[PDB]
Amino acid sequence: AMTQEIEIEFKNIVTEEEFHALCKSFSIEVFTKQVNHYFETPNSSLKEAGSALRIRHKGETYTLTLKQPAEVGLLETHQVVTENEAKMMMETNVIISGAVMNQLCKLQIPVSALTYMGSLTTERAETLFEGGTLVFDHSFYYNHDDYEIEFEVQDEETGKAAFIHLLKQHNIPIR
Amino acid sequence: AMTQEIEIEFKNIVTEEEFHALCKSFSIEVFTKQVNHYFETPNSSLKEAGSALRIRHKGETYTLTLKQPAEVGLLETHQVVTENEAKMMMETNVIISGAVMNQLCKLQIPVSALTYMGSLTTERAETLFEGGTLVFDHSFYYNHDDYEIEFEVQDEETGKAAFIHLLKQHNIPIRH
């Protein structure tokens, strides 16, 4: 149910034209839908502490996730919950107990002030690339849609070089 | 239960500090929560067509609202709907019939493709000012929260000059 991980992930915004070209370049055909239900306090506490708190619905699975700062990249705490647990967090704004609650209290978020603020649909595809994972994200936000390429790595120094090299190969500007 | 209006909107991004100062100038203390549930097709048809479709939930009310191009600004169509109707649209992706559906057909949006794509919360206060409605918004998006000032008017020329003069009066730079 419960895992934690250190995630090192570079991200670049891209245009629609660049996105479609890069997807054809990697033979990216199939996209997987996911929806993220995000939480925050009226004072933006999560954001102020470099952190994010979300319930991801992907397939039949719901996962409560906290991302927070680590020395390198982010420390992520995932907790699989049931649909009904997901819906009660969203309708009551009370966060279920367990690893994610434990980390929020140690971060000193005023947990009782957290509220369900909204949601976003992302279409996501991935592929293994230079011993990292290349991610193609198309997200539908309130008045606009956003295209991103991401790269999750094991080595921050060599991963970065590989990512910047890829962008350069494809004449994609660093954004 | 249904209205249409031609609407002209000016918007400026402000800092929290600018936002609180402008609020204090207008005796704005109370904010009202509002949630917008938005729809779009996989092809982004609505965005292509300069348009937006949302269900807004505020207070007791759900309002299905379509925004589309007018010769200047936007033609808004509003249709008040029931909780059940709102939920049905969000769960099944089917747009209820009436004035908003009729406008979507005229736009040639592939209506059967529209899907419920997400939602966002906004804390809002409005005051009547010069030719219109001055809006103070604090919105909570996925990655971040923003403060924005908007001005909704019917007269473009004078509306724009008044909004610009108000921003300079308070040393707020133009950020589109």
GROMACS .gro file of C-alpha atoms in nm:
model
  351
    1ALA     CA    1   0.000   0.000   0.000
    2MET     CA    2   0.281   0.233   0.114
    3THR     CA    3   0.607   0.318  -0.065
    4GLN     CA    4   0.859   0.608  -0.058
    5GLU     CA    5   1.112   0.710  -0.311
    6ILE     CA    6   1.358   0.977  -0.404
    7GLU     CA    7   1.256   1.108  -0.749
    8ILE     CA    8   1.490   1.305  -0.969
    9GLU     CA    9   1.299   1.447  -1.262
   10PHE     CA   10   1.381   1.717  -1.515
   11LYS     CA   11   1.088   1.894  -1.693
   12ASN     CA   12   1.060   2.109  -2.007
   13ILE     CA   13   0.752   2.289  -2.142
   14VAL     CA   14   0.704   2.233  -2.515
   15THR     CA   15   0.471   2.362  -2.785
   16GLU     CA   16   0.207   2.146  -2.941
   17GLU     CA   17   0.407   2.131  -3.263
   18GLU     CA   18   0.723   2.018  -3.084
   19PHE     CA   19   0.523   1.766  -2.882
   20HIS     CA   20   0.363   1.593  -3.176
   21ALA     CA   21   0.701   1.579  -3.357
   22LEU     CA   22   0.882   1.438  -3.054
   23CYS     CA   23   0.609   1.178  -2.999
   24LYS     CA   24   0.636   1.063  -3.363
   25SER     CA   25   1.011   1.061  -3.311
   26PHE     CA   26   0.985   0.810  -3.028
   27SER     CA   27   0.694   0.619  -3.190
   28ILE     CA   28   0.473   0.728  -2.896
   29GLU     CA   29   0.121   0.607  -2.990
   30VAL     CA   30  -0.065   0.511  -2.671
   31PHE     CA   31  -0.148   0.752  -2.394
   32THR     CA   32  -0.277   0.669  -2.044
   33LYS     CA   33  -0.521   0.892  -1.867
   34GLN     CA   34  -0.485   1.004  -1.510
   35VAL     CA   35  -0.660   1.253  -1.288
   36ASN     CA   36  -0.503   1.441  -1.003
   37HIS     CA   37  -0.706   1.577  -0.712
   38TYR     CA   38  -0.500   1.833  -0.532
   39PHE     CA   39  -0.513   1.981  -0.186
   40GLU     CA   40  -0.380   2.300  -0.024
   41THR     CA   41  -0.440   2.535   0.269
   42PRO     CA   42  -0.582   2.888   0.223
   43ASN     CA   43  -0.231   3.013   0.301
   44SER     CA   44  -0.059   2.798   0.044
   45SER     CA   45   0.132   2.606   0.313
   46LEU     CA   46   0.226   2.315   0.086
   47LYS     CA   47   0.362   2.545  -0.178
   48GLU     CA   48   0.553   2.753   0.077
   49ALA     CA   49   0.726   2.433   0.197
   50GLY     CA   50   0.820   2.325  -0.156
   51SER     CA   51   0.556   2.045  -0.143
   52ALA     CA   52   0.245   1.903  -0.314
   53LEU     CA   53  -0.035   1.675  -0.189
   54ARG     CA   54  -0.251   1.491  -0.440
   55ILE     CA   55  -0.476   1.190  -0.495
   56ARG     CA   56  -0.400   1.034  -0.833
   57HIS     CA   57  -0.678   0.828  -0.996
   58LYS     CA   58  -0.523   0.615  -1.269
   59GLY     CA   59  -0.706   0.306  -1.393
   60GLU     CA   60  -0.894   0.162  -1.096
   61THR     CA   61  -0.624   0.282  -0.860
   62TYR     CA   62  -0.622   0.578  -0.624
   63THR     CA   63  -0.290   0.681  -0.457
   64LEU     CA   64  -0.242   0.954  -0.198
   65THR     CA   65   0.091   1.118  -0.268
   66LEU     CA   66   0.300   1.373  -0.086
   67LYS     CA   67   0.603   1.524  -0.263
   68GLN     CA   68   0.847   1.728  -0.051
   69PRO     CA   69   1.202   1.859  -0.081
   70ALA     CA   70   1.496   1.621  -0.051
   71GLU     CA   71   1.866   1.711  -0.084
   72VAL     CA   72   1.853   1.594  -0.439
   73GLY     CA   73   1.515   1.609  -0.623
   74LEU     CA   74   1.203   1.522  -0.418
   75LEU     CA   75   1.105   1.273  -0.154
   76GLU     CA   76   0.772   1.109  -0.245
   77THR     CA   77   0.547   0.919  -0.011
   78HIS     CA   78   0.269   0.714  -0.187
   79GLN     CA   79  -0.021   0.548  -0.005
   80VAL     CA   80  -0.276   0.344  -0.205
   81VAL     CA   81  -0.626   0.406  -0.079
   82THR     CA   82  -0.966   0.277  -0.171
   83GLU     CA   83  -1.202   0.477  -0.392
   84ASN     CA   84  -1.426   0.547  -0.091
   85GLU     CA   85  -1.129   0.670   0.115
   86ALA     CA   86  -1.036   0.896  -0.176
   87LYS     CA   87  -1.393   1.035  -0.191
   88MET     CA   88  -1.418   1.102   0.185
   89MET     CA   89  -1.087   1.295   0.177
   90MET     CA   90  -1.231   1.501  -0.107
   91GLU     CA   91  -1.578   1.552   0.054
   92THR     CA   92  -1.461   1.607   0.416
   93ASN     CA   93  -1.111   1.750   0.369
   94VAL     CA   94  -0.985   1.510   0.641
   95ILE     CA   95  -0.665   1.331   0.532
   96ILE     CA   96  -0.656   0.960   0.611
   97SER     CA   97  -0.396   0.839   0.859
   98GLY     CA   98  -0.073   0.659   0.769
   99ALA     CA   99   0.258   0.747   0.609
  100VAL     CA  100   0.144   1.057   0.426
  101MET     CA  101  -0.018   1.206   0.740
  102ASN     CA  102   0.298   1.117   0.935
  103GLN     CA  103   0.516   1.318   0.689
  104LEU     CA  104   0.281   1.616   0.676
  105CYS     CA  105   0.294   1.647   1.056
  106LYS     CA  106   0.674   1.630   1.050
  107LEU     CA  107   0.674   1.902   0.778
  108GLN     CA  108   0.445   2.094   1.010
  109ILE     CA  109   0.167   2.159   0.763
  110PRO     CA  110  -0.150   2.279   0.948
  111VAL     CA  111  -0.323   1.963   0.836
  112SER     CA  112  -0.667   2.063   0.962
  113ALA     CA  113  -0.661   2.365   0.730
  114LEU     CA  114  -0.606   2.150   0.416
  115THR     CA  115  -0.886   2.156   0.163
  116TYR     CA  116  -0.969   1.984  -0.163
  117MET     CA  117  -0.902   2.257  -0.423
  118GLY     CA  118  -0.942   2.100  -0.757
  119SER     CA  119  -0.846   1.853  -1.020
  120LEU     CA  120  -0.666   1.812  -1.350
  121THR     CA  121  -0.659   1.550  -1.628
  122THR     CA  122  -0.326   1.446  -1.772
  123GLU     CA  123  -0.262   1.219  -2.072
  124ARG     CA  124   0.072   1.052  -2.012
  125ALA     CA  125   0.304   0.821  -2.204
  126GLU     CA  126   0.648   0.692  -2.113
  127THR     CA  127   0.948   0.514  -2.265
  128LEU     CA  128   1.288   0.396  -2.142
  129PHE     CA  129   1.565   0.615  -2.272
  130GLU     CA  130   1.937   0.627  -2.192
  131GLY     CA  131   1.876   0.437  -1.871
  132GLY     CA  132   1.617   0.691  -1.756
  133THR     CA  133   1.245   0.731  -1.819
  134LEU     CA  134   1.120   0.984  -2.079
  135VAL     CA  135   0.769   1.114  -2.003
  136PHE     CA  136   0.524   1.281  -2.249
  137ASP     CA  137   0.257   1.479  -2.063
  138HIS     CA  138  -0.044   1.664  -2.208
  139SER     CA  139  -0.247   1.826  -1.926
  140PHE     CA  140  -0.582   2.004  -1.960
  141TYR     CA  141  -0.588   2.306  -1.732
  142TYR     CA  142  -0.868   2.555  -1.679
  143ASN     CA  143  -0.822   2.774  -1.991
  144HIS     CA  144  -0.526   2.609  -2.161
  145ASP     CA  145  -0.357   2.287  -2.240
  146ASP     CA  146   0.008   2.223  -2.155
  147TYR     CA  147   0.264   2.000  -2.321
  148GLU     CA  148   0.569   1.877  -2.131
  149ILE     CA  149   0.856   1.643  -2.167
  150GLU     CA  150   1.013   1.497  -1.854
  151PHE     CA  151   1.302   1.272  -1.771
  152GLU     CA  152   1.330   1.070  -1.452
  153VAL     CA  153   1.683   0.961  -1.374
  154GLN     CA  154   1.914   0.788  -1.129
  155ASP     CA  155   2.217   1.025  -1.162
  156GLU     CA  156   2.134   1.398  -1.141
  157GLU     CA  157   2.459   1.500  -1.324
  158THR     CA  158   2.454   1.254  -1.614
  159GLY     CA  159   2.070   1.259  -1.641
  160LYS     CA  160   2.079   1.633  -1.679
  161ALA     CA  161   2.341   1.613  -1.956
  162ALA     CA  162   2.138   1.347  -2.140
  163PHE     CA  163   1.818   1.560  -2.111
  164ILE     CA  164   1.980   1.885  -2.229
  165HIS     CA  165   2.145   1.686  -2.513
  166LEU     CA  166   1.805   1.550  -2.619
  167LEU     CA  167   1.642   1.892  -2.617
  168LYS     CA  168   1.937   2.024  -2.824
  169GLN     CA  169   1.914   1.740  -3.076
  170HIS     CA  170   1.552   1.824  -3.123
  171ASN     CA  171   1.594   2.202  -3.134
  172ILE     CA  172   1.372   2.242  -2.833
  173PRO     CA  173   1.442   2.550  -2.619
  174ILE     CA  174   1.500   2.516  -2.243
  175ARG     CA  175   1.181   2.645  -2.065
  176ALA     CA  176  -3.280   3.041  -1.536
  177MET     CA  177  -3.108   3.146  -1.864
  178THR     CA  178  -2.932   3.462  -1.972
  179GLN     CA  179  -2.695   3.589  -2.241
  180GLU     CA  180  -2.468   3.894  -2.219
  181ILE     CA  181  -2.186   4.043  -2.424
  182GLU     CA  182  -1.886   4.081  -2.191
  183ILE     CA  183  -1.554   4.259  -2.221
  184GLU     CA  184  -1.283   4.153  -1.974
  185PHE     CA  185  -0.958   4.309  -1.875
  186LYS     CA  186  -0.723   4.109  -1.653
  187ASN     CA  187  -0.394   4.184  -1.477
  188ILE     CA  188  -0.174   3.947  -1.270
  189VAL     CA  189  -0.083   4.105  -0.934
  190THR     CA  190   0.146   4.019  -0.639
  191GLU     CA  191  -0.011   3.924  -0.309
  192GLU     CA  192   0.109   4.256  -0.171
  193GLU     CA  193  -0.045   4.454  -0.459
  194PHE     CA  194  -0.360   4.241  -0.421
  195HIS     CA  195  -0.400   4.317  -0.044
  196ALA     CA  196  -0.326   4.686  -0.097
  197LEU     CA  197  -0.587   4.715  -0.376
  198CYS     CA  198  -0.836   4.528  -0.156
  199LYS     CA  199  -0.781   4.775   0.130
  200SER     CA  200  -0.844   5.066  -0.111
  201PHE     CA  201  -1.188   4.921  -0.194
  202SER     CA  202  -1.303   4.801   0.153
  203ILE     CA  203  -1.291   4.438   0.026
  204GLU     CA  204  -1.270   4.192   0.318
  205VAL     CA  205  -1.512   3.905   0.240
  206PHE     CA  206  -1.436   3.649  -0.027
  207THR     CA  207  -1.678   3.399  -0.170
  208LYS     CA  208  -1.562   3.056  -0.277
  209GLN     CA  209  -1.641   2.942  -0.624
  210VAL     CA  210  -1.552   2.621  -0.808
  211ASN     CA  211  -1.534   2.595  -1.178
  212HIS     CA  212  -1.573   2.254  -1.343
  213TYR     CA  213  -1.444   2.269  -1.698
  214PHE     CA  214  -1.500   2.063  -2.011
  215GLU     CA  215  -1.306   2.022  -2.338
  216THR     CA  216  -1.253   1.769  -2.617
  217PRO     CA  217  -0.933   1.564  -2.665
  218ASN     CA  218  -0.864   1.788  -2.974
  219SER     CA  219  -0.910   2.111  -2.771
  220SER     CA  220  -1.200   2.220  -3.000
  221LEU     CA  221  -1.325   2.479  -2.760
  222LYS     CA  222  -0.981   2.635  -2.729
  223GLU     CA  223  -0.947   2.631  -3.107
  224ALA     CA  224  -1.279   2.821  -3.126
  225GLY     CA  225  -1.182   3.085  -2.874
  226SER     CA  226  -1.434   2.938  -2.633
  227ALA     CA  227  -1.474   2.789  -2.281
  228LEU     CA  228  -1.736   2.563  -2.125
  229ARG     CA  229  -1.777   2.535  -1.752
  230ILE     CA  230  -2.012   2.460  -1.472
  231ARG     CA  231  -1.969   2.703  -1.196
  232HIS     CA  232  -2.071   2.607  -0.844
  233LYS     CA  233  -2.113   2.907  -0.619
  234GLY     CA  234  -2.323   2.926  -0.308
  235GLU     CA  235  -2.644   2.738  -0.378
  236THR     CA  236  -2.619   2.761  -0.753
  237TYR     CA  237  -2.482   2.563  -1.041
  238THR     CA  238  -2.450   2.753  -1.370
  239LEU     CA  239  -2.353   2.600  -1.705
  240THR     CA  240  -2.174   2.872  -1.892
  241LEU     CA  241  -2.033   2.893  -2.245
  242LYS     CA  242  -1.795   3.175  -2.344
  243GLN     CA  243  -1.740   3.228  -2.725
  244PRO     CA  244  -1.606   3.508  -2.951
  245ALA     CA  245  -1.814   3.814  -3.018
  246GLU     CA  246  -1.709   4.097  -3.255
  247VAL     CA  247  -1.541   4.246  -2.950
  248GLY     CA  248  -1.498   4.054  -2.622
  249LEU     CA  249  -1.715   3.750  -2.563
  250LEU     CA  250  -2.074   3.632  -2.589
  251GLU     CA  251  -2.164   3.460  -2.263
  252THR     CA  252  -2.452   3.212  -2.237
  253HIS     CA  253  -2.558   3.109  -1.884
  254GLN     CA  254  -2.800   2.832  -1.793
  255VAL     CA  255  -2.880   2.757  -1.430
  256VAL     CA  256  -2.901   2.385  -1.372
  257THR     CA  257  -2.975   2.152  -1.083
  258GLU     CA  258  -2.718   1.972  -0.871
  259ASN     CA  259  -2.830   1.646  -1.033
  260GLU     CA  260  -2.800   1.791  -1.380
  261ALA     CA  261  -2.451   1.924  -1.296
  262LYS     CA  262  -2.342   1.589  -1.158
  263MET     CA  263  -2.478   1.402  -1.459
  264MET     CA  264  -2.277   1.617  -1.697
  265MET     CA  265  -1.963   1.569  -1.494
  266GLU     CA  266  -2.012   1.186  -1.467
  267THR     CA  267  -2.143   1.095  -1.809
  268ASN     CA  268  -1.994   1.379  -2.014
  269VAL     CA  269  -2.332   1.462  -2.171
  270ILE     CA  270  -2.429   1.825  -2.204
  271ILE     CA  271  -2.790   1.898  -2.100
  272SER     CA  272  -3.016   2.053  -2.359
  273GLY     CA  273  -3.107   2.420  -2.391
  274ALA     CA  274  -2.944   2.751  -2.474
  275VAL     CA  275  -2.585   2.641  -2.409
  276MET     CA  276  -2.628   2.324  -2.623
  277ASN     CA  277  -2.782   2.529  -2.903
  278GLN     CA  278  -2.478   2.765  -2.906
  279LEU     CA  279  -2.235   2.475  -2.906
  280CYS     CA  280  -2.406   2.324  -3.211
  281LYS     CA  281  -2.386   2.656  -3.396
  282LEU     CA  282  -2.014   2.674  -3.313
  283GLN     CA  283  -1.972   2.329  -3.473
  284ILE     CA  284  -1.805   2.179  -3.166
  285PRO     CA  285  -1.810   1.801  -3.174
  286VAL     CA  286  -2.038   1.789  -2.873
  287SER     CA  287  -2.020   1.410  -2.824
  288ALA     CA  288  -1.642   1.441  -2.766
  289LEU     CA  289  -1.672   1.693  -2.477
  290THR     CA  290  -1.534   1.547  -2.156
  291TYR     CA  291  -1.512   1.681  -1.804
  292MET     CA  292  -1.143   1.759  -1.769
  293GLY     CA  293  -1.101   1.910  -1.424
  294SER     CA  294  -1.174   2.179  -1.171
  295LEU     CA  295  -1.025   2.469  -0.975
  296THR     CA  296  -1.124   2.677  -0.680
  297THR     CA  297  -1.133   3.054  -0.679
  298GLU     CA  298  -1.194   3.289  -0.384
  299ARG     CA  299  -1.359   3.603  -0.528
  300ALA     CA  300  -1.489   3.947  -0.438
  301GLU     CA  301  -1.655   4.196  -0.673
  302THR     CA  302  -1.724   4.569  -0.646
  303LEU     CA  303  -1.902   4.798  -0.893
  304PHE     CA  304  -1.655   5.057  -1.026
  305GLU     CA  305  -1.665   5.307  -1.314
  306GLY     CA  306  -1.830   5.143  -1.614
  307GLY     CA  307  -1.838   4.797  -1.452
  308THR     CA  308  -1.741   4.517  -1.225
  309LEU     CA  309  -1.399   4.507  -1.069
  310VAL     CA  310  -1.315   4.152  -0.968
  311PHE     CA  311  -1.059   4.038  -0.709
  312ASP     CA  312  -0.965   3.675  -0.758
  313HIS     CA  313  -0.738   3.440  -0.571
  314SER     CA  314  -0.731   3.113  -0.754
  315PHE     CA  315  -0.574   2.775  -0.657
  316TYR     CA  316  -0.429   2.585  -0.953
  317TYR     CA  317  -0.249   2.254  -0.955
  318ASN     CA  318   0.109   2.382  -0.927
  319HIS     CA  319   0.044   2.731  -0.777
  320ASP     CA  320  -0.190   3.002  -0.662
  321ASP     CA  321  -0.241   3.342  -0.831
  322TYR     CA  322  -0.388   3.677  -0.752
  323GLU     CA  323  -0.562   3.858  -1.037
  324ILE     CA  324  -0.762   4.175  -1.089
  325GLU     CA  325  -1.029   4.179  -1.352
  326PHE     CA  326  -1.263   4.442  -1.485
  327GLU     CA  327  -1.576   4.340  -1.674
  328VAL     CA  328  -1.732   4.617  -1.878
  329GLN     CA  329  -1.966   4.684  -2.170
  330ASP     CA  330  -1.770   4.983  -2.319
  331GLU     CA  331  -1.432   4.871  -2.442
  332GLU     CA  332  -1.271   5.215  -2.497
  333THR     CA  333  -1.366   5.373  -2.167
  334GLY     CA  334  -1.338   5.044  -1.978
  335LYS     CA  335  -0.982   4.991  -2.085
  336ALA     CA  336  -0.882   5.353  -2.000
  337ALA     CA  337  -1.040   5.328  -1.658
  338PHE     CA  338  -0.869   4.994  -1.580
  339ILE     CA  339  -0.533   5.129  -1.694
  340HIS     CA  340  -0.575   5.449  -1.493
  341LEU     CA  341  -0.671   5.248  -1.186
  342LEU     CA  342  -0.355   5.034  -1.217
  343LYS     CA  343  -0.128   5.341  -1.250
  344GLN     CA  344  -0.304   5.518  -0.962
  345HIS     CA  345  -0.176   5.227  -0.747
  346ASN     CA  346   0.163   5.163  -0.909
  347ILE     CA  347   0.069   4.826  -1.044
  348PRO     CA  348   0.243   4.739  -1.364
  349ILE     CA  349   0.059   4.589  -1.662
  350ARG     CA  350   0.097   4.209  -1.661
  351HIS     CA  351  -0.132   4.031  -1.920
   0.00000   0.00000   0.00000
